Motif scaffolding. Sequence first.
Motif, PDB file in Angstrom:
ATOM      1  N   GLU B  75       0.906  -1.217  -0.055  1.00  0.00           N
ATOM      2  CA  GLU B  75      -0.091  -0.009   0.051  1.00  0.00           C
ATOM      3  C   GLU B  75       0.873   1.348   0.069  1.00  0.00           C
ATOM      4  O   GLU B  75       0.667   2.252  -0.890  1.00  0.00           O
ATOM      5  CB  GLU B  75      -1.040   0.027   1.168  1.00  0.00           C
ATOM      6  CG  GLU B  75      -1.947   1.404   1.365  1.00  0.00           C
ATOM      7  CD  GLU B  75      -2.760   1.520   2.402  1.00  0.00           C
ATOM      8  OE1 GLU B  75      -2.328   1.240   3.487  1.00  0.00           O
ATOM      9  OE2 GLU B  75      -4.135   1.394   2.042  1.00  0.00           O
ATOM     10  N   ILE B  76       1.939   1.321   0.944  1.00  0.00           N
ATOM     11  CA  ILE B  76       2.676   2.668   0.944  1.00  0.00           C
ATOM     12  C   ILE B  76       3.509   2.573  -0.385  1.00  0.00           C
ATOM     13  O   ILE B  76       3.623   3.676  -0.925  1.00  0.00           O
ATOM     14  CB  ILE B  76       3.717   2.193   2.085  1.00  0.00           C
ATOM     15  CG1 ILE B  76       2.953   2.524   3.359  1.00  0.00           C
ATOM     16  CG2 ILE B  76       4.811   3.548   2.069  1.00  0.00           C
ATOM     17  CD1 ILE B  76       3.729   1.914   4.658  1.00  0.00           C
ATOM     18  N   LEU B  77       3.899   1.691  -0.824  1.00  0.00           N
ATOM     19  CA  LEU B  77       4.659   1.664  -2.196  1.00  0.00           C
ATOM     20  C   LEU B  77       3.800   2.299  -3.294  1.00  0.00           C
ATOM     21  O   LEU B  77       4.113   2.811  -4.105  1.00  0.00           O
ATOM     22  CB  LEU B  77       5.584   0.290  -2.603  1.00  0.00           C
ATOM     23  CG  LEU B  77       6.700   0.061  -1.642  1.00  0.00           C
ATOM     24  CD1 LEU B  77       7.254  -1.390  -1.774  1.00  0.00           C
ATOM     25  CD2 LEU B  77       7.702   1.135  -1.889  1.00  0.00           C
ATOM     26  N   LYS B  78       2.411   1.752  -3.582  1.00  0.00           N
ATOM     27  CA  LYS B  78       1.704   2.254  -4.509  1.00  0.00           C
ATOM     28  C   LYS B  78       1.209   3.603  -4.320  1.00  0.00           C
ATOM     29  O   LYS B  78       0.811   4.315  -5.200  1.00  0.00           O
ATOM     30  CB  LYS B  78       0.245   1.194  -4.357  1.00  0.00           C
ATOM     31  CG  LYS B  78       0.696  -0.131  -4.843  1.00  0.00           C
ATOM     32  CD  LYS B  78      -0.848  -0.713  -5.085  1.00  0.00           C
ATOM     33  CE  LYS B  78      -0.627  -2.196  -5.173  1.00  0.00           C
ATOM     34  NZ  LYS B  78       0.599  -2.675  -6.378  1.00  0.00           N
ATOM     35  N   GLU B  79       1.450   4.119  -3.095  1.00  0.00           N
ATOM     36  CA  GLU B  79       1.238   5.626  -2.982  1.00  0.00           C
ATOM     37  C   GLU B  79       2.413   6.351  -3.348  1.00  0.00           C
ATOM     38  O   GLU B  79       2.481   7.698  -3.099  1.00  0.00           O
ATOM     39  CB  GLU B  79       0.755   5.904  -1.485  1.00  0.00           C
ATOM     40  CG  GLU B  79      -0.435   5.286  -1.214  1.00  0.00           C
ATOM     41  CD  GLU B  79      -0.794   5.396   0.366  1.00  0.00           C
ATOM     42  OE1 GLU B  79      -0.439   6.267   1.097  1.00  0.00           O
ATOM     43  OE2 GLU B  79      -1.953   4.922   0.688  1.00  0.00           O
ATOM     44  N   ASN B  80       3.593   5.749  -3.345  1.00  0.00           N
ATOM     45  CA  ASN B  80       4.875   6.603  -3.860  1.00  0.00           C
ATOM     46  C   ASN B  80       5.806   5.795  -4.966  1.00  0.00           C
ATOM     47  O   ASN B  80       6.752   5.103  -4.616  1.00  0.00           O
ATOM     48  CB  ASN B  80       5.756   6.149  -2.371  1.00  0.00           C
ATOM     49  CG  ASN B  80       5.250   7.047  -1.203  1.00  0.00           C
ATOM     50  OD1 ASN B  80       5.660   8.243  -1.095  1.00  0.00           O
ATOM     51  ND2 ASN B  80       4.499   6.587  -0.365  1.00  0.00           N
ATOM     52  N   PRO B  81       5.125   6.142  -6.145  1.00  0.00           N
ATOM     53  CA  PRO B  81       5.939   5.662  -7.127  1.00  0.00           C
ATOM     54  C   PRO B  81       7.150   5.989  -7.355  1.00  0.00           C
ATOM     55  O   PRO B  81       8.084   5.233  -7.934  1.00  0.00           O
ATOM     56  CB  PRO B  81       5.080   6.011  -8.556  1.00  0.00           C
ATOM     57  CG  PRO B  81       4.107   7.231  -7.711  1.00  0.00           C
ATOM     58  CD  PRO B  81       3.862   6.741  -6.477  1.00  0.00           C
ATOM     59  N   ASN B  82       7.590   7.335  -6.977  1.00  0.00           N
ATOM     60  CA  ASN B  82       8.903   7.918  -6.914  1.00  0.00           C
ATOM     61  C   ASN B  82       9.846   7.083  -6.035  1.00  0.00           C
ATOM     62  O   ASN B  82      11.126   7.048  -6.587  1.00  0.00           O
ATOM     63  CB  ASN B  82       8.851   9.595  -6.461  1.00  0.00           C
ATOM     64  CG  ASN B  82       8.651  10.371  -7.746  1.00  0.00           C
ATOM     65  OD1 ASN B  82       8.104   9.867  -8.826  1.00  0.00           O
ATOM     66  ND2 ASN B  82       8.869  11.761  -7.677  1.00  0.00           N
ATOM     67  N   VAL B  83       9.400   6.469  -4.985  1.00  0.00           N
ATOM     68  CA  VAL B  83      10.147   5.623  -4.275  1.00  0.00           C
ATOM     69  C   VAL B  83      10.543   4.203  -5.141  1.00  0.00           C
ATOM     70  O   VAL B  83      11.549   3.442  -4.808  1.00  0.00           O
ATOM     71  CB  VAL B  83       9.828   5.195  -2.941  1.00  0.00           C
ATOM     72  CG1 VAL B  83      10.206   3.997  -2.184  1.00  0.00           C
ATOM     73  CG2 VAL B  83       9.669   6.417  -2.003  1.00  0.00           C
ATOM     74  N   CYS B  84       9.327   3.741  -5.855  1.00  0.00           N
ATOM     75  CA  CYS B  84       9.678   2.427  -6.574  1.00  0.00           C
ATOM     76  C   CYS B  84      10.758   2.703  -7.902  1.00  0.00           C
ATOM     77  O   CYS B  84      10.740   1.636  -8.561  1.00  0.00           O
ATOM     78  CB  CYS B  84       8.427   2.146  -7.119  1.00  0.00           C
ATOM     79  SG  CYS B  84       7.347   1.649  -5.618  1.00  0.00           S
ATOM     80  N   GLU B  85      10.788   3.752  -8.294  1.00  0.00           N
ATOM     81  CA  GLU B  85      11.840   4.082  -9.479  1.00  0.00           C
ATOM     82  C   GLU B  85      13.286   3.748  -8.860  1.00  0.00           C
ATOM     83  O   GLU B  85      13.587   4.194  -7.697  1.00  0.00           O
ATOM     84  CB  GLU B  85      11.572   5.626  -9.922  1.00  0.00           C
ATOM     85  CG  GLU B  85      10.380   5.730 -10.573  1.00  0.00           C
ATOM     86  CD  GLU B  85      10.434   7.143 -11.398  1.00  0.00           C
ATOM     87  OE1 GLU B  85       9.337   7.933 -11.404  1.00  0.00           O
ATOM     88  OE2 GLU B  85      11.443   7.006 -12.077  1.00  0.00           O
ATOM     89  N   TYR B  86      14.167   3.658  -9.851  1.00  0.00           N
ATOM     90  CA  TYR B  86      15.432   3.651  -9.366  1.00  0.00           C
ATOM     91  C   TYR B  86      15.957   4.668  -8.948  1.00  0.00           C
ATOM     92  O   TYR B  86      16.766   4.977  -7.902  1.00  0.00           O
ATOM     93  CB  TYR B  86      16.370   2.969 -10.493  1.00  0.00           C
ATOM     94  CG  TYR B  86      18.096   3.159 -10.054  1.00  0.00           C
ATOM     95  CD1 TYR B  86      18.542   2.310  -9.025  1.00  0.00           C
ATOM     96  CD2 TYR B  86      18.862   4.130 -10.834  1.00  0.00           C
ATOM     97  CE1 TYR B  86      19.851   2.391  -8.481  1.00  0.00           C
ATOM     98  CE2 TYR B  86      20.218   4.157 -10.222  1.00  0.00           C
ATOM     99  CZ  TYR B  86      20.679   3.459  -9.274  1.00  0.00           C
ATOM    100  OH  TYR B  86      21.881   3.561  -8.539  1.00  0.00           O
TER     101      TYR B  86
END
Lengths: 389, 389
Positions: B75-86
Motif C-alpha cells: 500500500e505504501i509503495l503504491k502511494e509512492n511511485p517515485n520511491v519505486c523508481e531506481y
Amino acid sequence: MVSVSEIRKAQRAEGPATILAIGTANPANCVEQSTYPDFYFKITNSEHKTELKEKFQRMCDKSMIKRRYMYLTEEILKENPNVCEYMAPSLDARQDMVVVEVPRLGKEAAVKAIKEWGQPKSKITHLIVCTTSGVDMPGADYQLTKLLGLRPYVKRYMMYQQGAFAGGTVLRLAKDLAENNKGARVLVVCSEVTAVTFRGPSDTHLDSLVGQALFGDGAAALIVGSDPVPEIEKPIFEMVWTAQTIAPDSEGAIDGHLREAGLTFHLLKDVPGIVSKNITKALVEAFEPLGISDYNSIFWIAHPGGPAILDQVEQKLALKPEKMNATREVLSEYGNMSSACVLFILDEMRKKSTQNGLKTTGEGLEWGVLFGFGPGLTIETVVLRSVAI
Amino acid sequence: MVSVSEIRKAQRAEGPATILAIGTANPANCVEQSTYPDFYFKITNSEHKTELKEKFQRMCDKSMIKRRYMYLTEEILKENPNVCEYMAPSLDARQDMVVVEVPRLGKEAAVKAIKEWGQPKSKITHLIVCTTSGVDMPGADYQLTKLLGLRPYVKRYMMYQQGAFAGGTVLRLAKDLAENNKGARVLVVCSEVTAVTFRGPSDTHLDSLVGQALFGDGAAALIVGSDPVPEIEKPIFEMVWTAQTIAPDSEGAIDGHLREAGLTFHLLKDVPGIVSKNITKALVEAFEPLGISDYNSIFWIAHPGGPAILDQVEQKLALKPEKMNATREVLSEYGNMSSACVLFILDEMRKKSTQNGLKTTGEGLEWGVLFGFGPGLTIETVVLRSVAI
C-alpha cells in the motif's frame, strides 16, 4: 585467568580532560553586513519585495554582526538559481558543495591546532567531527582522517545534523573519551557551512529570513587530553563537569528539516526568552556544588545564536557588560557559525587574556562556564577551569 | 580552593561497562524471501527486465535470508511511485516516513530493554541513538526522550548517517560514557528503516540491487552501565577493549550518498575479500594482549553484511561452522538491519546460551569478539567477556 579489574585500572587516564590547542579557519570570502541587504535581495531576485527588504535591513542592523565569511559567492549563487529561491529542489547541489567544503575547512583548522599542540599527529587516538551542513558515507570524519593523514585506527565519532548547541556536545563527548583512556589525545573539529541553509526571502517565512542575517561559516579544532606532559604540552582550559537539558515549554522553538530543498529552519516560540528563563537553573546545577553563586565571578562563553539571547541573559542575571565581550567579538567578526562559535570564543578569550597580561586564560578568573543553545530547545553546559598565564 | 582531583575521583565509575538489558523490535510486515523477486519486480514495474530479474532471483537465493520485516508495504509503495523508481526525487517522502518510524520502532525496543533492566527510567543518565535512515532537528534522540518520558537532562548522543558498522560504534561510545561517570546508566538505541534506501532495479547498477536482496528493518536497545548493583541488576556481557580501523586498499568499497532521490549505495571493491584479509590483524590486536590466539576458543558476533562476508571469514580463520550460528540465525530471520544487527546477535546468543543450559551467556566461553563492518571500509572491534549463567 585474565583480570578485568587490572585491565580497567591500566586502561584509564587520571586527570581532567584538558584543552591543549585551539585552531580556527573560515572561507576566504568576507561578506560585510552593512551592504548585505542590498546584495542578498539582488542575488535572490527579490528587489520588488520592498517591505520585506526593509524588515531584513532592520534584522541586519540589529544583528550586531559586522561581517561573516561565506563559502557561497556571487559566482556560485549565479550558477545555482535553485539555491537562491526560497524553496526549490537543491539538496544535491548543496550537498556537492558541503561534502567537500566541510572537511576542507575542518582540515585548515585542524592543521593549525596540531601545529600549536606540537606533537606527532600519530598520537591522535580519537577524532570527533561535528557539522550541521550535509551528510555522507563515509562521513567527514573519514575524509579528515584521509586529508590529515591520521592513523587509520583513529577512533572516530561523526556528529551529524547536530545543530548549534553541539560545540558544547563535542566538549561533553571529548571529556569522557580523554578521561577514560590513558594516553588518549582527541582531535575535535566543528565545521559549519551555510550552503545548506542559504535560501531566498519569503514574507510568510520571517523565521527563515532571520537566519539569513545571522548565519556564517567557519571551523574550529581542538586537541583534548588528560594527563598533559608538563612543559611539552600546554593546558589552556580544563573541563570539570558537563550537562545537557531540554528547556520546559520550548517545543518547536528551533526546528530544522533536511529536505529536497536543503535545510530549512522554523522558529515557533521566543528563543531569547526561553534561554533567559532557564539559564539560572543551569548555573545553579553547575555551580552550587562548587560553592559559587556570583555569576560575575566566573568567565563566560555563550553561543551567540543572536544578540537578543545575549542581551536578555545579561539583563536577567545582571552580568556586567564585559562578561560577554569575547562572545560578542566573535559574533561581530564572524556571525553565528553554529556549533563552531563557542570554540572560536574560547580561542578569542585565551588569546586576549594572554595578549593583555592577565593571570589566567579565563580573563584572570579561575572558574568559567560555556553554554551551547540549539534545537530542542537544548542547553549544553560545560564547567571550565582556567590555567595560570 | 576547589580540588579538581577530588571532583574527578568522585565523579568516575570503577568497573567495566556492562550490558544489563537487551530488547529488540521490528515492523509488523513480514516479507518472505522466497517470493521477494516476484513481489519486488512487480511493485517496481520491472517485469519486462527478464535477465535482471533472474540475477535478482540468484541474489535472493544466495542471500541466506528467509524473511525480513519491512515498514514499507505494498500500500505504501503504491502511494509512492517515485520511491519505486531506481532514481526519482523522493527524499521528502522517505524522510516523512523515517523521521517518525525510527523513533517509533526504537521506542518499542527501548521499552522492552527498560522492562528487563527493571529500574526506574529516571535513572537513565545518557542516551545514544543511532540510525542510517533519515536525519532531523531536533533528532530522533529528542523524539525518544519525549516518547519514553526520560528526564529532560538525559545526556544525548545522536549518531546519524553512520552506516552498518555502528552497532560496534555505539558500544565503543557507551563503554566510555558508563566507565567515566559514577552511576551512569546509558540507554543505547539502534533503529534502522529501509524506506530511505528502497528503490527500483537498474541493470547498470547491480551494486544497488544487491542491497534490495539483503536490507531489512529493526531496532535494538541496550542498557549499559558500570558497577552493577549485585542481584538488583543483572550483567549479560562486559566490554573490555575496543578499536576502530579503516582497511587498507578499500577506498570506495561501500559509499552511500543521501540525495534528493534518497540514500543510494555503491560498491566498488570486494567487501568479503577486504574483510577476510584484514580480520586477522584485528583479532591479533584485540587478543594478543589477553594471551589468546585460538579464535575458536572465543564467542563470535559479526555484522552479517552478506553471507559471503561470513563464509570467507570462516574459511580464512578455519572457524568451526558453529561459531557463526547466532550471527547466521539473525541474518536468516531478519536480514541485514545495518547497525542493529550485531545487537540482535548479542540477544540471540545470550538467549540461546541461557535457554540451553550453557555455563555463560557467551555460549559457555569466557571471552568473545563483536565486529561491525561498513563504509570506509571500517571495522569496529569490541572485546567482550561473558557472564556466568
